[PDB]
Amino acid sequence: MSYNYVVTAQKPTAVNGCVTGHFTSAEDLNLLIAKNTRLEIYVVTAEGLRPVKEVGMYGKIAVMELFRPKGESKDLLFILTAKYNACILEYKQSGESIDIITRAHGNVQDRIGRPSETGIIGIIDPECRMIGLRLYDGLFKVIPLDRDNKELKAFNIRLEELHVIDVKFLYGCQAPTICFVYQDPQGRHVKTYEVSLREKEFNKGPWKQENVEAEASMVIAVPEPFGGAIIIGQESITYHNGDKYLAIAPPIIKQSTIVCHNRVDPNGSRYLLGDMEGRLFMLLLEKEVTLKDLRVELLGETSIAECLTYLDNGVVFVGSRLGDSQLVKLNVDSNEQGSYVVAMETFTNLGPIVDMCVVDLERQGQLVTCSGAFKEGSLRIIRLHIRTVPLYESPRKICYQEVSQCFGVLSSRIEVQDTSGGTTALRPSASTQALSSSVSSSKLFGEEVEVHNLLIIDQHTFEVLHAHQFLQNEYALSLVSCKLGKDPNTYFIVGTAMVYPEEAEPKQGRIVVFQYSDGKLQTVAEKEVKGAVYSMVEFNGKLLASINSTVRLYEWTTEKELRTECNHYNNIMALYLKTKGDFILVGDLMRSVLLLAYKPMEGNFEEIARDFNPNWMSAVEILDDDNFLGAENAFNLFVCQKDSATDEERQHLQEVGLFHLGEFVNVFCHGSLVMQPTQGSVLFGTVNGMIGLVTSLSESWYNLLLDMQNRLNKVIKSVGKIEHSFWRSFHTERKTEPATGFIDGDLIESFLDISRPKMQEVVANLQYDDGSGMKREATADDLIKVVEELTRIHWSHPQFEK
Amino acid sequence: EFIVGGKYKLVRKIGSGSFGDIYLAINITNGEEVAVKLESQKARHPQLLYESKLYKILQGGVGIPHIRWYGQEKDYNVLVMDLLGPSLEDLFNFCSRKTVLMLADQMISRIEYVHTKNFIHRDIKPDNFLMGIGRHCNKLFLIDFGLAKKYRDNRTRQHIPYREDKNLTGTARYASINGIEQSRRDDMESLGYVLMYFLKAATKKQKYEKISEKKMSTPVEVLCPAEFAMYLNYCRGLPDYMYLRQLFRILFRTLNTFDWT
């Protein structure tokens, strides 16, 4: 409602960065893994990874680096957040207690400027003298690393080149030298500069070159005694060092693009390369003092990697966003072709979550999600206890049919065009290895096509019972399971579209009704429509469908056909469609919320209210009759309500809640008792693999929790000294605003983790409106009871460190 | 300046000596040349409303204009229509003082429309015919309907019962026999005198009655093709005018653009 509560049920599982070094101690190798807002520190042992510390950050980690300035015992950590909070951190251990000390902090945002489309780049020079940040186009930000710079004072230098791809610091230079690749109307070029801290200007670089591939994207700074840089492109790998030039065009890397790299040897002898499909490569540099040749070889297949890191004993960490992270072993020998990899450990990743459903509410619900993409796609069953069902293709939508005791999954696979006019599969997938198969109709280079299938899955064994392949060029968009009219049968209903590359807007589509009976899937009825069926919902025994921009209501006839009842035409596309009673919630991709009602006597649709604010929207939900929930651009949640106190105001929806979550929400579901003072229960799944819970509070509870939140902010020490209020503020490129109407449950549940004297300090002078009726000085025990009752609305996280 | 209804502007004078001096208006929003007949609210001759009503009952045709606006403005009533053009009279005497009879059947065709539209013009003179401008440069238009008698009555047009000893001065040179009330025959008899055209004094008994008696003293054959002279006679005998038209088409074809064109 107007006052909501947001808590984390599952922490994000996707990896966006990882570094090695000596952070905990100078004699121990440490792996630091950056997940969204979570920092995990591991010690590299012979057995594997030993967790020691995990911390939460008040921001999304964008830059993470380890550096050792002169006169320091061990490494320091540099963190930059997506809201431009820059900190330098130290690891301190006094017996059992472990803390992260903040050495310097500040905000490096510029009041004017447009964020770069290629993102945020952060580099530290090998001599530990400055920090280079690329935050806005045409500007380069330098942070000196002197001891007496604790507010992180920075100055800006002007870059003539507006479109910069990558930038790095070079080894072996007497002055801090940077190398970067930029794009201009001529093409892409490589250039160097020298950075003077006295003059705060760019000097002339040691060398300049022009011969850079049109698809060059990666810069690698080779250490001593080689020096120079390696530029990685789609077809060629080049080494530039002054007058030296070497190039290779290996045929093995043309299939996919190299997206990540890491260094194996301290002197740059060997490097690790990873591409978009999961291939692992080795880059070898030959030496006589000077470089002779470059060689590339294939090591094997791993998960689709976002980052790669070497762990100093032949063990490599694969940090994935589309699938499970791996620890692999590089062997000198092989099985088929030289130097294969062997997997030894797998770490769970639930992201991305594109759809989900709640099942088995009779007795304690369970969550079934569509996770991953390409060969990493799978079904996750969450009780936390997680079970994995690999599909080896991309799951899109999911629903549950209780009468048949089966799941309906919409999926897609990628096939390449062969010379014979047909298509060939790249790997065995679920849709190719089903018990029974069917097609809608049979029809007949190196181009990738999408084939869409409907999969029936047993709820006990999770095997594939029936696969149905749709028409060529048909894109399946929606899926429902329901009973229609007076029919006692349950049906699978799929809404599709016809997508041709020469047509911008689909002009054809169809709605198909399937029935699963006696172990086979049959087609009952099909209806041809003149648009794309983006969404479908069951509306009081009828079918509500969204064709392009119109909303159509269908009736199920005794002859097993769909008959149109009423049409409603809008100016927007009905991408999002939710229902409660007789009310319909409509939304498009540009955050245009429309509230409609069905007039049963008149047999048409009436418009109740609307709210048009141009911003990118990813999901919506209905909390109750009056309040509606949604997800905004950046990573935000909003709540709108109606009829708050003429028709001008009654037809307007105003925003009563704003919050910055930090995650991109894809799906909302009513998981009332998935995990068995609060009202309602809604779950959401994000791109990073995070699962959250939204409940509704009353006025008194909201006031109490807001006051407790404000008091807790004064006593809890943040990592990097970021303020919680700034972190939770609604963020857009054009507007920033404090959060309203939302209670942060993670901070509230942090109350149980603090020491008793700090609890006494927090609970001092707090008037408690107990159930007795009269307010009295609250004690720590009452707030402990309140917080434990709040934690009971979701499961309990297990211990992380040993 | 005199702005007619806040939409027109009277720039100059094109005809005077009339009941309504015919001005040249200009549309301040379009640019079109417009004819405006202007008469006083206390003018001696209020023909403005008369002719506007006759135009209104005309409602279409190749010889009747379109009324752009009517109503009234302060003490000067106003009628705005399309700019008609030059009078057939002020083209026959300006040019030089086939064309005659080709126009005549156009006039003959015009009068069928007025007779079929249940009224009579009754005031036929070369002044009252005007050539169009531009697209209408070759089409005859009959105007000056202020002196036009309306036969519309209950149900179908009923000719009012004839009344002897009537006076006619509008058709000064075409009065002819007309005590006898002006009617369909009287319309077409003035046309023959117009086709023929193609001792005065203050006393009317000498300036109108003597002209009429000399007009009908001798048969039309001596004054005149004698065949169409006797068509005129038997046209004045008045039904027959449809026959007269077909006969005049025969005459037009049996003779093996106009003067100024």
Partner: protein, 375 residues
Amino acid sequence: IINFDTSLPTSHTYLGADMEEFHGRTLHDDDSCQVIPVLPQVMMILIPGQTLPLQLFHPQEVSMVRNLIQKDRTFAVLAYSNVQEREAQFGTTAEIYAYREEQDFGIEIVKVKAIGRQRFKVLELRTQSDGIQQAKVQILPECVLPSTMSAVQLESLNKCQIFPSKPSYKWWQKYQKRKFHCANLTSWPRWLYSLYDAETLMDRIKKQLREWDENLKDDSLPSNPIDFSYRVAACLPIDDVLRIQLLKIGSAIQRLRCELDIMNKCTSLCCKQCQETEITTKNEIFSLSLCGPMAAYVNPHGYVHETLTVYKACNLNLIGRPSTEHSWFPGYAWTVAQCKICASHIGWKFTATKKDMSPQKFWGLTRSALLPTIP
């Protein structure tokens, strides 16, 4: 449009080629309350970037313009829902860049050329004693939105997120595949995201316009989405309610989508009085000016007409002789055109004087007398 100069109609040379030209801008900050004078005679919906010529006769307007020249040169053009009671909810701010005054005929005339700058919302209308209208104004913001992938994009592909420039159906396939690669991390496919991409929408609009009007040079349209949308909205021959709807839109993407929807829906221009006869078809529309097929011109008596230039028109009646005075298009003579049925003013027919020019015959039609038919 051969041997004819398209830049001539833009200078409005029929008013005088010796105007006083003013260089400078004045942009009001977003979401602020300001008081702006309103010209009492203008009944036009001004789109930003559009040029408005004016001839002012009444002394109060002359005094207002003389005062405005010395102070921020901004007046308000109200998009009236209905001109009957002079009420409106939105409008635009117009700035003067050309000004001259003449004492002809014993009276005072002021000639002004103005350009539209900013959209606003009307809070209050005050008609003070002297006889002019001052309005309380809130400046509406221009909404610039980032790429849809800026919320889902992985940082690794962001390096290749820029692409080599244009040399193209294969190129647009590559653009869609590579720009919206991370669409598989969400619930929507790539073509849906292409349906909300400003560059793709601009390309589609340009393709449609070039198909309808082949003489459209490639560089005649702006490269910015906002300017492109404003120019297209100005040049579209639509009715007042649709123009108000386009003026209420704050985002360039939504404006482009609305313009595509207007273009795709079949249209044949019909008379407003009759609503049954068809004057012109969309195939016979050509751009004789640099601005486009439609632009605003002023007549000798200070009435602003929006003229659409078409090669051929049907069921029109020509009254009068070709007159060359005060012609909006130099080297042509105009004849008044009325509807063959209702005899209402629809426009003019222009016939050239020389014989080495081209075209020699064409038609100009006023927007207020035209109605778009949607089957």
